[PDB]
């Protein structure tokens, strides 16, 4: 009806007016959704579509059932997004047809960049190889990046300092600037897997164990003593599945590893802007 053509028209005018509004917050989805099928969508054909573990930038709220935002991927058009409420409905109306974990996790508007490997942090080889990358980033993305240290154990996400650091990370990402964390306690992807930080794990992967072993020897007797715990840490990371990391710096030349990481962060920047 007539009053329906105005609502849809206006709904669509709210959708476009929001096209350039600030990113209120972000969510990582825990379920898939096919909005192109959702008939109740305020505007036929404006429903977002996403698989589980995707990221969404919420611009504004339309109603209790719908938000307005977009998928965090290049060419991510603004759209209507079902709220946890509406998703719950849908989850139940598909339950009755067969004869609690939330649909969304609120995450930082920019996923925290975190480095792991080639081995244990605290030792010269890993610390220096990662230091070289932090310096490169401080330079390549100067003007739109924040690189900060976190000594608090984030994998716990003292429990007060941890909370305070979680909040600090959210604040840093609010401006949509790149956020890189030099987190001393994170040596393995699984240590952040159950947090709500949804980091961009960058694996600095040394080709072979023989090589890493010789890099350690290059450091001197002091480092060589802790040879066994560095090699084990290396084995654990290497025994991890690919999907466990977002970026795998595979190259043996620093500048190539840097360009790899930069290309990736540049695609991310376009995706979030």
């Amino acid at each position: 009806e007539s009053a329906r053509r105005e609502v849809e028209s206006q709904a669509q005018q709210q959708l476009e007016r929001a096209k350039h509004k600030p990113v209120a917050f972000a969510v990582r989805t825990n379920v898939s959704y096919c909005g192109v099928l959702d008939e109740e969508c305020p505007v036929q054909g404006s429903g977002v579509n996403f698989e589980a573990k995707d990221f969404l930038h919420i611009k504004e709220k339309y109603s209790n059932d719908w938000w307005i935002g977009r998928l965090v991927k290049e060419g991510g058009d603004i759209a209507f997004i079902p709220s946890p409420q509406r998703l719950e409905s849908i989850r139940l109306k598909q339950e009755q047809k067969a004869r609690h974990v939330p649909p969304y996790d609120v995450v930082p508007s920019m996923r925290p960049v975190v480095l792991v490997g080639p081995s244990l942090k605290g030792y010269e080889v890993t610390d220096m190889m990662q230091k070289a990358l932090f310096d490169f980033l401080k330079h390549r993305f100067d003007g739109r990046i924040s690189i900060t240290r976190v000594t608090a154990d984030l994998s716990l996400a003292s429990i007060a300092e941890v909370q305070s650091e979680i909040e600090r990370i959210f604040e840093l990402a609010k401006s949509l600037q790149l956020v890189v964390l030099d987190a001393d306690t994170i040596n393995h992807p699984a240590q952040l897997a159950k947090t709500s930080l949804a980091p961009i794990i960058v694996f600095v992967k040394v080709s072979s164990p023989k090589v890493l072993q010789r890099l350690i020897r290059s450091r001197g007797k002091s480092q060589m003593k802790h040879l066994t715990v560095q090699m084990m840490a290396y084995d654990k990371l290497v025994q991890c599945p690919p999907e466990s990391f977002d970026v795998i710096l595979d190259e043996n030349q620093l500048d190539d590893a840097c360009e790899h990481l930069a290309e990736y962060l540049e695609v991310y920047w376009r995706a979030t802007h």
Binding site: V125, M128, M129, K131, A132, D135, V206, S207, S208, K210, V211, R214, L215, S218, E251, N252, Q253, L254, A257
Partner: peptide, 25 residues
């Protein structure tokens, strides 16, 4: 034997060492 592994080791070592020395700056 397997002179390619030896070559590979020399290539990776040299690169990774330079990577480390660059951070020593």
């Amino acid at each position: 034997q397997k002179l390619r592994e030896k070559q590979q080791l020399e290539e990776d070592l040299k690169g990774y060492l330079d990577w480390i020395t660059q951070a020593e700056d």
